[PDB]
Nucleic acid binder design. Structure first.
Length: 298
DNA sequence: GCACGTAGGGGAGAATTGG
RNA sequence: CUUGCUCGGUUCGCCGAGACUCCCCUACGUG
DNA sequence: CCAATTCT
């Protein structure tokens, strides 16, 4: 399942003010300060409505309005599974230390001498019982089924300056021709460049790509982001993920490029089929402002 | 101290069911 | 092959050659 | 209609 990455275009509130992330941060801060004995008593978390309403009331951890079961089994299963990772990290190395004790022992009966002194075992919990190398907060907002990207609709989805594309209509194939533009119009190829163009089928960049305008010592092209950041919005492909009262609109063009260069899909594909080649569980990065889609088994 | 290999733990659904 | 990114050419209009398994966290070396 | 359920 190779990755695929898309850019966020709209955002009701930042991803750090989201109850899905506010709860997630609160859950693991409470957990990462447990002793090896408090975790066992507090590690009886179910995958049900009643159990999660028991865990979130017995263990104090506040809920900011988040009571979605499918979005609380990606927070309470990841947190405790990373918790055991630190102890496992210790005892997958200490195991090799007690395998090292085997290594020194094996030669020892051959010599016949009594076994030599060996290193002791090092735990992962400090003197107070709290974990020594306490994990850090994962900022990733993992998505669940009932909230998956869907095509943007101007009617039902909230009013937003954009253009909506019907699933039924196949996604258009941009800049089909290259040299058919008259002089001056953004996209015009000068006549001298027309000889010695590519005879091979490669990715085609559009005139407002940053790679075409990136500053470098040999370039004298003026960068004005009041134009290269407005032409792209009209031609964008919006897909929306709506958690509660909060909605993210992304740019599906990052998925359209992926299928093209990997041979999965041709020029004529619907938005449904484009979104149907990927998992319905994006991964979000609040700091970068990016969403990471994944493929399927085929 | 920014920077870097590195090493090593974790993570990256979706088909039925029921009010 | 419409976004993003890297190394280049340009009459400055956009053209050539590419990369694509990524993210989080905690450790230990290099000056 | 759409959350909660059970399995890899």
């Amino acid at each position: 399942c190779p990755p695929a990455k898309v850019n966020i275009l709209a955002q009701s509130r930042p991803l750090s003010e989201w109850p899905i992330n506010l709860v997630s941060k609160g859950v693991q801060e409470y957990v990462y300060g447990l002793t090896a004995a408090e975790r066992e008593a507090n590690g009886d978390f179910g995958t049900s409505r009643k159990s999660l309403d028991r865990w979130f009331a017995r263990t104090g951890v506040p809920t900011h309005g988040y009571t979605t079961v499918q979005g609380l089994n990606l927070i309470l299963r990841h947190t405790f599974n990373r918790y055991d990772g630190v102890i496992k990290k210790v005892e997958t190395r200490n195991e090799k230390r007690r395998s090292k004790a085997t290594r020194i022992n094996v030669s020892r009966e051959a010599d016949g001498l009594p076994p030599i002194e060996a290193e002791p075992e090092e735990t992962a919990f400090g003197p107070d019982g709290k974990l020594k190398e306490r994990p850090g907060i994962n900022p990733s907002i993992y998505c669940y089924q009932q909230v998956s990207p869907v095509p943007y609709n101007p009617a039902k989805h909230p009013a937003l300056p954009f253009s909506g594309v019907d699933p039924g209509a196949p996604l258009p194939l941009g800049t089909p021709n290259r040299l058919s533009i008259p002089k001056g119009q953004p996209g015009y190829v000068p006549e001298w460049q027309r000889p010695h163009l590519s005879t091979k089928n490669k990715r085609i960049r559009k005139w407002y790509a940053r790679a075409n305008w990136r500053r470098k010592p040999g370039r004298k092209s003026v960068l004005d982001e009041a134009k290269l950041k407005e032409a792209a919005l009209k031609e964008a492909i919006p897909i929306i993920v709506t958690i509660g009262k909060d909605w993210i609109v992304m740019d599906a063009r990052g998925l359209l490029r992926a299928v093209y260069w990997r041979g999965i899909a041709k020029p004529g594909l619907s938005l449904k089929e484009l979104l149907g080649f990927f998992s319905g569980d994006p991964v979000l990065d609040p700091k970068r402002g990016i969403a990471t889609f994944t493929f399927k088994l085929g």
